[PDB]
RNA sequence: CGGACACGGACAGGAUUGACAGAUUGAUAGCUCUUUCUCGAUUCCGUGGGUGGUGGUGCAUGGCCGUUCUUAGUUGGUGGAG
């Protein structure tokens, strides 16, 4: 009840992610990948095929979330605003975390990992 | 581009930087082209708006300077004359 709601929010303040239309499916080629997250709304079944092509045989875990636009208020391009339009992003389908930087509430997402995925 | 900002568009399922080789050039200017890797919201597109200019106008001006002007010249106050 803590995993899906707020402990992924606390890993998004100024952490490393993907951003824009040229590096979303990029960070799997690097040896700095912590917890990543992929949408269960992807219009092609080859993009999600491409991200599981690496991580399923390696040390990297995807979280299946609802869509990518709802990750748009997660990535950092702030469109929820007082005098601004609350629909400006078409958000990311695959962001990663290079590094946590702080250790407030990061145990709970990795506790989700080795609880069932072993 | 060294066109700031403001709005909209473009916009993670593909906005934008940079670049080896070669016809390509005056030029090892990725200038353009063929091919293809790379850069991480930085931008790019449109519209308003700045901005820059050894661009005009010295008869729109300021400031400085030259000149009649190297000669002795100039002016109020108060009385007097009109
Ligand atoms: Zn002119």
Swiss-Prot record:
PROSITE patterns, A to Z: RIBOSOMAL_S12E
Keywords: Acetylation, Cytoplasm, Nucleus, Ribonucleoprotein, Ribosomal protein
Modified residues (N6-succinyllysine): 115
Gene Ontology molecular function: any one: RNA binding
Location in the cell: Cytoplasm; Nucleus, Nucleolus
UniProt family annotation: Belongs to the eukaryotic ribosomal protein eS12 family.
Subunit structure, interactors included: Part of the small subunit (SSU) processome, composed of more than 70 proteins and the RNA chaperone small nucleolar RNA (snoRNA) U3. Subunit of the 40S ribosomal complex.
UniProt-recorded name of the protein: Small ribosomal subunit protein eS12
Originating species: Homo sapiens (Human)
């Amino acid at each position: 009840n803590t995993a899906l709601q707020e402990v992924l929010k606390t890993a998004l303040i100024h952490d490393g992610l993907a951003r824009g239309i040229r590096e979303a499916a990029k960070a799997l080629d690097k040896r700095q990948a912590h917890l990543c997250v992929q949408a269960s709304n992807c219009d092609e079944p080859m993009y999600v095929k491409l991200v599981e092509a690496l991580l399923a045989e390696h040390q990297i875990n995807l979280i299946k979330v609802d869509d990518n636009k709802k990750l748009g208020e997660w990535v950092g391009l702030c469109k929820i605003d007082r005098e601004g339009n609350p629909r400006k992003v078409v958000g990311c389908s695959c962001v990663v975390v290079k590094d946590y930087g702080k250790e407030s509430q990061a145990k709970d997402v990795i506790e989700e990992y080795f609880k069932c995925k072993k």
